[PDB]
Structure formats: C-alpha cells, structure tokens
Amino acid sequence: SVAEINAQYYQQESAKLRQQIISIQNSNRQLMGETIGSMSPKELRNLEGRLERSITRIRSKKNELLFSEIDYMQKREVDLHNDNQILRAKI
Amino acid sequence: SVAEINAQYYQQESAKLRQQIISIQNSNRQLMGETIGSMSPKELRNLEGRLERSITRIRSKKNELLFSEIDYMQKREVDLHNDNQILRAKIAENRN
Amino acid sequence: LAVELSSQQEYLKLKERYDALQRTQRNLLGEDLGPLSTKELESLERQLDSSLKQIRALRTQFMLDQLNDLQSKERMLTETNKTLRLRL
Amino acid sequence: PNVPSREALAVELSSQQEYLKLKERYDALQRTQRNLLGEDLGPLSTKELESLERQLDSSLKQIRALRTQFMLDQLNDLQSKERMLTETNKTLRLRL
C-alpha cells in the first residue's frame, strides 16, 4: 500500500513537471525573441523592458567577473613576489 | 587708425577660434569612436559610459516625437468628431 | 515495488530537466549568472541585442502605421466637417 | 589726406567676415557635440536621430570589443607571469 501510494504520488508529480517543462520551454523561447513577429505593441513594450534589464545585468556581470579574475591573479603575483624575497633573504 | 586696429582684433579672435575649432573637432572624433585605436582601457571605459547614456537619450527622444505626433492626432480626431455631432444636431433640430 | 521505483526514476529525471530549464530562464532574465563564462555571457548579450533591435524596429513600425491611419481619418473627418459647415 | 585706404577697409571687412565664419563653424560644432552626448535634441528630425543611433551603436560595439580584448590580454599576461613566479618559487626551494 505504501509503495503503491508513493508510486502514484511520483506519477502525479511527474505529470505536473511535464506541464511546467512545455510551459517554460515556450516562455524561454519568447524571452529569446522567437515570437517577436506575432506580438502586439503592448507585448513588445513589455518584452523590451525585460530584455534591456537582462542585457544591462549580463553586460555588467561579464565585466565584474573579468575584473575579479584579474584582481585575483594580480594579488597572486604580489603574494608570489613576496614569497620569493623571503626565500632569497632567508640568508 | 580704427581700421587697422579693428582688423587686428578680428585676426586675434580668428586665431583663437582656429584652435578651438580643431580641438572640438578632435573631441567630436573621439565621441564618434574614431580614436579607439589609440585609447587606453580606462579611456574606452569612460567613453562607453558616455555613449551608452547618449544612445538611451536619443532613443527616448525619437520615441517621444512619435508619441507626441500620435497624441496630437488622437485629440484632433476627437475634436473633429465633436464638431461633426454638433452639426448633425443642427440638421436634426433646425431645418427639421 | 518495481512500479514505485520506476515512477521515482521518471520523477527525478523530469525534476532535473525542469531545474535545468529554470536555470536557463533565470539567465535569460539576467539572474544567477555566477556559473557562466565570459563567452556564455557574450553569447546571451548578442542574442538579447539582436532581439532588442527587432523589437524596437517593429514598435516603431506599429506607431508609423497608427499615425498613417490617423492622418487618413483626419482627412475624412475634415471634409465631413466642411460639408456640414456649408450645409449649415 | 586723413582717410583710410580702400584696401585697409577691404582688409578690415575680410578679417571680420573670416571671424564671423569661424564663429559659426565653432557654434555648429558645439551643437554637433551636444547631440553626440544626447543633449539639445529639440531641432533633430527622426531621420537625424536614427542616424545618431546607428553611429553610437556602431561605436559602442567597437569599444566593447576592444575593452574585452584588453582584459583577456591582461589576464593572459598575468597567467604567464604566474607560471614564471611558481617555477622561480620552486627552484628557490633548492636553496631552501
């Protein structure tokens, strides 16, 4: 009984997931700009605002990560140049 | 003499202006992205920020012109619709 | 027991498929970008920039059509007005 | 004979017109500059705004491409230095 009720719980939740998957696949396509051609002026206004926000954040992120990796490797340079003067001046 | 002194005052001002012109043409060429090949990373970052701001303002403006023209024509449409219903109430009553 | 286990494996696979699509969506909205490389971010940037050019062009075309339609109606309503003007 | 020569008048006028012509070029170039920054857009037609939009967007793409190239080069240089400072550390472990 417990195995049979668990089995039908997972099949119910699997059905729910199949709905959300098709639904999110469509929503993603819309955000990727594949339905622009058939959209109303209102729908275009909406999507423009969302995509301008996305491109600002993505551009900004791309820059922050580059800066951070540069910042890391610059410190790693200092830290190694200091490690080499301790080793030399050891004697 | 007045004419020689006037001439030299203008030539002084023309020499100032020649420099200002060439200098502002160069600043303009920078804003147009022509000198990116001689610019440091810091200068490119600066110029990106200013042009990202310009392009935004230019797009807003472009859209306003359209919004404004449309808004004007919609109020025209209503105004003319109102004129014509007054005159359709003039046929119905007088000349009745 | 075997039907329960098969039912669970199905549910985990679908769960993982959905979580992956949720991560993809978050990125399309400009969120949870931590995992992505410079290259992946550039790729999104190119896609977004392309969609935005297309959106803007169509929004402007809808507004030109709307305006063209309003000019047309303005002409019709002005000759309708001058007709009533003379008739009265 | 206390009167300016015809040629001192013609020089004076010429100098003045030169000055006025340069002053208009500078004024025009200042307006051009304002527009490039996304300002004083009032007089512009939609076609002129579109032309600006295309120019700015073109510049921004060039800038960003070079900013990114500079940052990848900078990173590759640091990775190269980090290898030469690790083997200097590891051969200094001989002296240790």
Side-chain angles (χ1 to χ4, degrees), chain A residues 1-89 91:
Chain A
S1 186
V2 167
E4 280 163 294
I5 72 84
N6 278 129
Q8 51 84 300
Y9 165 86
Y10 290 128
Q11 283 189 26
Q12 152 211 285
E13 291 299 301
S14 276
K16 287 180 187 183
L17 279 168
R18 291 193 297 274
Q19 187 66 60
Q20 290 171 62
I21 284 167
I22 187 104
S23 184
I24 211 199
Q25 271 157 172
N26 291 326
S27 280
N28 291 4
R29 282 185 196 105
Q30 178 179 292
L31 294 165
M32 277 166 112
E34 292 175 14
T35 73
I36 286 164
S38 45
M39 274 175 115
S40 66
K42 196 181 179 187
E43 290 165 308
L44 286 176
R45 293 182 183 174
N46 180 273
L47 182 64
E48 188 180 353
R50 300 183 79 129
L51 298 195
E52 288 278 4
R53 168 182 182 294
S54 307
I55 203 181
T56 301
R57 294 164 76 69
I58 280 171
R59 189 171 305 137
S60 155
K61 176 60 48 159
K62 177 203 70 198
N63 282 127
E64 294 166 55
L65 298 190
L66 274 187
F67 286 139
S68 289
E69 194 169 344
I70 288 168
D71 189 44
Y72 173 76
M73 292 285 311
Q74 276 175 344
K75 285 169 184 177
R76 195 97 206 73
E77 194 183 359
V78 159
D79 290 353
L80 282 174
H81 268 127
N82 279 195
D83 172 62
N84 284 351
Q85 48 79 355
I86 66 167
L87 268 282
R88 285 181 309 259
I91 281 300

Side-chain angles (χ1 to χ4, degrees), chain C residues 21-32:
Chain C
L21 287 162
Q22 184 59 40
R23 291 193 297 274
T24 293
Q25 182 172 81
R26 289 282 283 168
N27 297 160
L28 292 172
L29 299 169
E31 308 291 337
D32 303 346

Side-chain angles (χ1 to χ4, degrees), chain B residues 25 48 53-54 57 59, chain D residues 25 38-39 53 64 67:
Chain B
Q25 276 176 182
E48 171 176 7
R53 168 191 178 295
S54 304
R57 302 165 71 72
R59 273 177 196 132
Chain D
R25 180 77 170 120
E39 307 295 356
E53 181 187 358
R64 286 167 184 154
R67 282 193 52 201

Side-chain angles (χ1 to χ4, degrees), chain C residues 43-83:
Chain C
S43 174
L44 283 178
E45 179 176 3
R46 284 190 303 265
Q47 183 173 51
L48 289 160
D49 183 72
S50 188
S51 300
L52 283 164
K53 287 200 208 309
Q54 181 181 350
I55 292 168
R56 294 177 199 134
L58 280 189
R59 288 189 39 181
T60 286
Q61 195 54 58
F62 278 123
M63 279 181 300
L64 288 173
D65 289 342
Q66 182 184 7
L67 178 72
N68 178 254
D69 176 79
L70 286 167
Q71 283 160 358
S72 160
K73 285 172 184 163
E74 188 260 21
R75 286 193 291 284
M76 170 190 127
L77 271 105
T78 45
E79 63 80 41
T80 299
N81 180 270
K82 296 296 290 298
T83 55

